[PDB]
Design a protein around this motif. Sequence first.
Motif, PDB file in Angstrom:
ATOM      1  N   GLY C   9     -40.029 -22.266  -3.744  1.00 50.14           N
ATOM      2  CA  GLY C   9     -38.754 -21.602  -3.507  1.00 50.14           C
ATOM      3  C   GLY C   9     -37.641 -22.609  -3.686  1.00 50.14           C
ATOM      4  O   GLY C   9     -36.624 -22.340  -4.313  1.00 50.14           O
ATOM      5  N   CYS C  10     -37.873 -23.797  -3.153  1.00 53.94           N
ATOM      6  CA  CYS C  10     -36.908 -24.874  -3.181  1.00 53.94           C
ATOM      7  C   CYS C  10     -36.558 -25.281  -4.613  1.00 53.94           C
ATOM      8  O   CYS C  10     -35.396 -25.383  -4.965  1.00 53.94           O
ATOM      9  CB  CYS C  10     -37.490 -26.054  -2.400  1.00 53.94           C
ATOM     10  N   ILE C  11     -37.566 -25.512  -5.430  1.00 53.49           N
ATOM     11  CA  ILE C  11     -37.353 -25.939  -6.818  1.00 53.49           C
ATOM     12  C   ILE C  11     -36.685 -24.851  -7.652  1.00 53.49           C
ATOM     13  O   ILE C  11     -35.829 -25.132  -8.470  1.00 53.49           O
ATOM     14  CB  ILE C  11     -38.670 -26.364  -7.478  1.00 53.49           C
ATOM     15  N   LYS C  12     -37.073 -23.607  -7.424  1.00 50.59           N
ATOM     16  CA  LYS C  12     -36.483 -22.497  -8.146  1.00 50.59           C
ATOM     17  C   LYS C  12     -34.988 -22.446  -7.889  1.00 50.59           C
ATOM     18  O   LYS C  12     -34.199 -22.221  -8.794  1.00 50.59           O
ATOM     19  CB  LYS C  12     -37.118 -21.192  -7.699  1.00 50.59           C
ATOM     20  N   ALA C  55     -17.881 -24.859  -6.638  1.00 49.29           N
ATOM     21  CA  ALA C  55     -19.058 -25.458  -6.496  1.00 49.29           C
ATOM     22  C   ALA C  55     -19.815 -24.056  -5.885  1.00 49.29           C
ATOM     23  O   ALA C  55     -19.420 -23.612  -4.807  1.00 49.29           O
ATOM     24  CB  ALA C  55     -19.221 -26.584  -5.576  1.00 49.29           C
ATOM     25  N   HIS C  56     -20.947 -23.839  -6.556  1.00 53.03           N
ATOM     26  CA  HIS C  56     -21.728 -22.820  -6.125  1.00 53.03           C
ATOM     27  C   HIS C  56     -22.827 -23.317  -4.990  1.00 53.03           C
ATOM     28  O   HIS C  56     -22.988 -24.561  -4.910  1.00 53.03           O
ATOM     29  CB  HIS C  56     -22.572 -21.925  -7.158  1.00 53.03           C
ATOM     30  N   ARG C  57     -23.187 -22.336  -4.146  1.00 50.12           N
ATOM     31  CA  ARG C  57     -24.338 -22.198  -3.130  1.00 50.12           C
ATOM     32  C   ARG C  57     -25.397 -21.056  -3.201  1.00 50.12           C
ATOM     33  O   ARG C  57     -25.141 -19.923  -3.636  1.00 50.12           O
ATOM     34  CB  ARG C  57     -23.626 -22.036  -1.786  1.00 50.12           C
ATOM     35  N   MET C  58     -26.574 -21.372  -2.658  1.00 52.42           N
ATOM     36  CA  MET C  58     -27.720 -20.437  -2.606  1.00 52.42           C
ATOM     37  C   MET C  58     -28.521 -20.768  -1.368  1.00 52.42           C
ATOM     38  O   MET C  58     -28.823 -21.937  -1.118  1.00 52.42           O
ATOM     39  CB  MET C  58     -28.661 -20.569  -3.804  1.00 52.42           C
ATOM     40  N   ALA C  59     -28.855 -19.742  -0.596  1.00 49.36           N
ATOM     41  CA  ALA C  59     -29.688 -19.936   0.583  1.00 49.36           C
ATOM     42  C   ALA C  59     -31.173 -19.749   0.285  1.00 49.36           C
ATOM     43  O   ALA C  59     -31.553 -19.107  -0.672  1.00 49.36           O
ATOM     44  CB  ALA C  59     -29.263 -19.001   1.697  1.00 49.36           C
ATOM     45  N   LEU C  60     -31.996 -20.326   1.151  1.00 52.77           N
ATOM     46  CA  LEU C  60     -33.442 -20.300   1.019  1.00 52.77           C
ATOM     47  C   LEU C  60     -34.078 -20.058   2.375  1.00 52.77           C
ATOM     48  O   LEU C  60     -33.646 -20.613   3.379  1.00 52.77           O
ATOM     49  CB  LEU C  60     -33.921 -21.625   0.473  1.00 52.77           C
TER      50      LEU C  60
END
Lengths: 540, 557, 60, 55
Positions: C9-12, C55-60
Amino acid sequence: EDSLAVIGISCEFPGAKDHYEFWNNIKEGKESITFFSKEELRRSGISEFVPAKSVLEGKEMFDPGFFGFSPKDAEYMDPQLRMLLLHSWKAIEDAGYISKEIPETSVYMSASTNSYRSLLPEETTADGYVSWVLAQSGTIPTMISHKLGLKGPSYFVHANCSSSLIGLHSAFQSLQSGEAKYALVGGATLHTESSPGLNFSSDGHIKAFDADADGMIGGEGAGAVLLKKASDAVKDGDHIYALLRGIGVNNDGADKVGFYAPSVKGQAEVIQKVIDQTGIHPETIAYVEAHGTGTKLGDPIELSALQSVYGRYTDKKQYCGIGSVKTNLGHLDTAAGMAGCIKVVMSLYHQEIAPSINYKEPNPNLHLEDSPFFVAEEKKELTRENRAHRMALSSFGLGGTNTHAIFEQYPAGPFIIPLSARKKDRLKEYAKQLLAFLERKTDTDLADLAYTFQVGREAMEERAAFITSGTAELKRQLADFINDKPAVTGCFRGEKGKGPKLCEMWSKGVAINWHKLKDKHPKRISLPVYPFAKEPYWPK
Amino acid sequence: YYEDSLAVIGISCEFPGAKDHYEFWNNIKEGKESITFFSKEELHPGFVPAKSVLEGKEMFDPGFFGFSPKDAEYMDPQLRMLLLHSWKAIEDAGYISKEIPETSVYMSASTNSYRSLLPEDGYVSWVLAQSGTIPTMISHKLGLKGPSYFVHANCSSSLIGLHSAFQSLQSGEAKYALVGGATLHTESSVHQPGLNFSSDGHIKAFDADADGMIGGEGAGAVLLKKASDAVKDGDHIYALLRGIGVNNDGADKVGFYAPSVKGQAEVIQKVIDQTGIHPETIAYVEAHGTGTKLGDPIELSALQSVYGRYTDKKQYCGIGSVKTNLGHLDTAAGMAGCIKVVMSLYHQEIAPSINYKEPNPNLHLEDSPFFVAEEKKELTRAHRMALSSFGLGGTNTHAIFEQYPDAGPFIIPLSARKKDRLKEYAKQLLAFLERKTDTDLADLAYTFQVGREAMEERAAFITSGTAELKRQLADFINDKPAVTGCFRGEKQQAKDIAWLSDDDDSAELIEKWLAKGKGPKLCEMWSKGVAINWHKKHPKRISLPVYPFAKEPYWPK
Amino acid sequence: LDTAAGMAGCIKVVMSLYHQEIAPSINYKEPNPNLHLEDSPFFVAEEKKELTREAHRMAL
Amino acid sequence: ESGISEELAPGFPAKSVLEGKEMFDPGFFGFSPKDAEYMDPQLRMLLLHSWKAIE
């Protein structure tokens, strides 16, 4: 307002029994060509063929008893004559008029030469001479004039394909000339056919304005419209679908290579002629209904010619819709102009542009990008800003006769409804249809409906007269009437002194429901027209 | 006043989506983009976007100039294009080239290795088409006797021309100047990101999403005069050019491919000192507009810095790139930017810079004197606009422009090399006349009488009014009209003309023709030879349509 | 991949940000109406989304 | 949200609504629940409001 107004319409086209059904069909993109399975048993035995036809049902139907005609007479009559007769009566009804009260009316008709007489058995020395008279072109407009009692000039006009516009053009000069008050133009093509190649389609579809465009497919239809001078139409409080600003007529010169060759320069001249004549400015035009044959050679020519004229008056853009109804209907030959004419009078009436179907990607030959036009792909509604939208219509004959036209957009408690018919089922069928009409269209004003039936429908042999305070009352009186004998309401049936229940003695007396409705009269309105009997006649 | 700089009194150009300067303005003002895309059905999509193309780069008119067809083929398209444009720009001015010999010519072009397209032989035809050949061929064909040479810096080519023209005219070494630029390519199709090149095939101007630029093709030319020499002469002026400066970056990291802040800064300052024009007086700046993340910040940083050193303190100034509409012009970049700014001043509107959504975080645009223009504003002291172009070399240029703010029978002589050209000439004249509801035929007639060469094939019209003309024109085009208004003719009466040539006798009688103002008979005589149509307080020259060259295509195979 | 679930999930996600794209979730025909995404801030990623800087973000 | 998609379903396609017209606090006034069910909603509402307005 030096142009005409379309105040009445009647038509039958493949898959449409009237102009209202016709308009809904083209609006939602439905195609009226037919395909057959191996359910092709009209006749048989082959391949290599496209089992596709654009037939229109009920071409043999007629109501001979209405015009005091004999069944032998009908069989002798060309379906086209019969059809145009039915349609003319209807178009004038649509207008809200009685045939015989508006006598100063001209008649212009056109029809194909189908060799109908050829299917009859005998033509031997004396009778038989009657069949020949009934088989002439002049008989059609002239029969309608006699039957409707019209005393304006009546004749037949033909230039293949472009013939319906030849009617409008005739009507236009006549109406402008002041020689007639009203004009009636109709066109028909019904064929006598049972018993790919040269721009015939491969797949049975008219792919108009597409890369994959190949040929055309034929169709049948008839229609008629009633025209009046525009200035007089407003003044008289007539009901106007649209305005006809101008119409040019011209024939390709010996320029073209061959008789069936279309010519750019010839088409260009008519479009130019109308602009010059009208004074209309090409930016003014929202939509153009092209000839739209669906041929590889033609479509490029057609557009080249338009773009070329428009290029003259103002600078390139892409503001104008271009389409063809043939996509839906096929090529209607004689009544092609007629179908285009209606499709467009209807689009202006409802203020919508109607899609051109069987289109995915444009023709690279077209240079559509620099042209002012975009091919209409989906229905888009026109704006509310400008109250006078305009649309143009093109028709170019096989002969080399080209036509172009431009149209413009035009912006109590107790009623009595008199209903009459030649026969009691008729009068009964009449009732289902008014009933059915009322259901659908609701915010429909009874005041006008009453006015329009009191006038503009002839008082025929068998009668029902209704007294009502509302529609809802009306349906119920009508709803119950349809079923044979309730007897329940203010309903009277049968086969100076102002103000009262005159119905019973209009059941059959007379009444000129003219003095009733003091200083201000209601509008005439477009309502269901007489229901003709549907009886088949055709040679054996 | 300071009417020491020049007036631009003629324009001609062809750009993507625009075939003349008028169409060009409507496209940019409306926000129209002229890049082109190909759907995948035309004859490998790792990263394959589409192109921005100039239609009719091949087309040419050799016969106009006494050229062999084989010559055209041996001729660089750019050279051919710059020839036609130079002719047009002078007609746009309302002058006859022969009559204004004191004109300098500066042209610039992308060397597109055109010659390598041809097959060949130590024995027959040299065919040494050089850069110097372009300006000189034009000077010869138009007969111009001012210094004529080729100037090149890479993106700042056109601006070098304006700079040359500027020094030349102030120096008084010529009365007029004609500057052109042009880049046409010969590779025929479409790129990939990675070290510049738009990912998506769009030019992001000062937008966050800027990733690079896309190449473009165009050519244009302008005619210039000294400002005073324009107003006094009664010429027709689109705009004024106050100053134009040039300099180079020097050595700096980024030996060669980058946008040096200090260098761009130096020129903008330099021009200002020269023009001593305040900055608050600038409504709009037409920037370099590269569309790269690194560059656009550099431009603004430098631009702002110059403004910062001035009473500024307010976001009052529009900033844009026409490169967004058209792409990057190899050697017409400057010309394109130039025309947009002259056109913006002429019509008093600012033109949107398209393909913009959100401010680049890096611009730091809110403290700045600039706001990016997302729309079709209007405007309403005269207005000023600035222009930038920064070379691949590191030769930068900046310029400032200023606004130039404000009968009976008529005779129109129409001429061309051929009859077909003449009919088409009419269509264009007619098409133009539709385009405007009131113009002036005093002026239209004047400009055609003078400022159009009287060629071989002639049509002369005598008219009373505007729609009176449209109707006669329509007939001539259809071509079998008996209907008068016009006299047809052809330069061929040597037995009547050279023979009866005003031999300094065309006098009291030809004069009668003027000293009276009897038109038609005059049209007759002109229909074959010889009439100085100069005898009118005369009307002013006006920008009207120009010679429609035949468009015949030549290209190596 | 139980232990290595987070890792994948992290690498994706780390990868999606590197290239500024959103990678599609597969085997999706129609949403389970038990999520009520209608009022959910969320929409399932049926196909992808190339993205644009802003600057973009994504949660995991 | 009947199979009458017709005139408007004019007959009236949209409504102007007061949420909680039924709601009430009967016990406040010494009212049996049975009693509230007999009283008109308009009366109940006017009762609560009259209390509220004076407050």
